Automatic annotation (TrEMBL):
Tree of life domain: Eukaryota
Protein name, as recorded: Ebony
Protein's gene: e
Alphabetical UniProt keywords: Phosphopantetheine, Phosphoprotein
Residues of the full protein shown: 666 to 877 of 879
Record has Transcription as a keyword: no
């Protein structure tokens, strides 16, 4: 059995968190696959290095240790949705973040509560690369359960994120997240007029989830 514990994000965790995020988003993210070629591993580490200081001092993120091996197997990066640092991304990841604002924007500022310390935005979540299906699912259940803990403890109103993989979308529904948008990713039109995820099947969705604490 996998026994885990949650530990607040520290400055030393920079390389371990990045390697978990890179070994979980690169070539596995359901959105960036349709933007090939032109998505590199450093495109995620560049964004992480840009906000690593802000991410640690906000005191909302954590890593997950395997207490048996005392090593990091997962991490959950979170921000105040009304206090997120804005990055100037220069790769094709800007298209992804503009699309996530397409989904999150109109809902966050017109339906979710106003003011700070209200919306805890689940920014990123990852697990170690060589985890088996049992440990990866167990780690996702642990990170989901612990994100709720951080929300209630920090006196937030709810948790809010956009789920782009079928596993996170099913975990969210199973965890009683309310669905506020089930957008079809191949219908999104970029500013240049094209559809960057246009080659995606109609079954691939971008679901905007929200859950009160
Ligand atoms: N906030 C939604 C989670 C997310 C963030 C960045 C991405 O590149 C991605 O595919 C998914
Ligand atoms: Ca998260
Ligand atoms: Ca808020």
């Amino acid at each position: 059995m996998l026994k885990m514990e949650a530990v607040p994000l520290r400055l030393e965790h920079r390389q371990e968190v990045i390697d978990i995020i890179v070994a979980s988003f690169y070539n596995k993210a359901d959105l960036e696959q349709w933007l090939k070629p032109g998505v590199l591993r450093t495109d995620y580490s560049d964004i992480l290095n840009d906000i690593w200081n802000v991410l640690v001092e906000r005191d909302l993120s954590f890593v997950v240790y395997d207490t048996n091996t005392d090593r990091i197997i997962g991490t959950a990066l979170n921000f105040d949705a009304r206090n997120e640092p804005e990055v100037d991304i220069k790769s094709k990841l800007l298209i992804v973040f503009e699309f996530l604002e397409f989904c999150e924007g109109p809902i966050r500022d017109n339906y979710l509560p106003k003011g700070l310390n209200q919306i805890l935005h689940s920014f990123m979540m990852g697990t170690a690369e060589k985890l088996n299906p049992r440990e990866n699912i167990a780690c996702m259940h642990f990170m989901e359960h612990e994100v709720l803990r951080v929300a209630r403890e920090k006196q937030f109103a709810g948790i809010f994120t956009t789920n782009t993989s079928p596993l996170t979308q099913q975990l969210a529904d199973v965890y009683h997240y309310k669905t506020l948008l089930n957008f079809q990713v191949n219908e999104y039109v970029h500013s240049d007029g094209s559809r960057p995820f246009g080659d995606a099947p109609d079954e691939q969705r971008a679901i905007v989830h929200w859950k009160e604490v």
